[PDB]
């Protein structure tokens, strides 16, 4: 598998070399969003945690369609600020409970290296 540690300092540089196939070899869930919150990448580990079929969610809006429970100042509010500020690095716990068993996770959001893309990393706690 891919040996990348959750919350690593240079994770945006390392994941810059990973294709969709490589992302699926991570020890934790990984989502790539555009500045509007549309889903660009969604790896296997994330799909194990949420039950979503990765291919099926790419293209939908994370905050509108897929994960309305994140539509809150505590999640989406922080996202919208990072995008507007052009910088984002934050780590917090949250509960995912839409159409699923309530699951506690640690979330790390961080701006990608290139363009207008942002990472959302998730692991169980
Ligand atoms: C609330 O809706 C939280 C999270 C979440 C994450 C991924 C997917 O697919 C659904 C929901």
From Swiss-Prot:
Keywords: Chromophore, Photoreceptor protein, Receptor, Sensory transduction. The 4-hydroxycinnamic acid (p-coumaric acid) chromophore is covalently bound via a thioester linkage. SUPFAM superfamilies: PYP-like sensor domain (PAS domain). The modification S-(4-hydroxycinnamyl)cysteine is found at residue 69. Transmembrane segments: none annotated. Residues 23-86 form the PAS domain. GO terms for biological process: phototransduction; regulation of DNA-templated transcription. The keyword Glycosyltransferase does not apply. One of its GO terms (molecular function) is photoreceptor activity. It holds the Pfam family PAS. Photoactive blue light protein. Probably functions as a photoreceptor for a negative phototaxis response. Belongs to the photoactive yellow protein family. NCBIfam families: photo_yellow. Monomer. This is Photoactive yellow protein. It comes from Halorhodospira halophila. The gene is pyp.
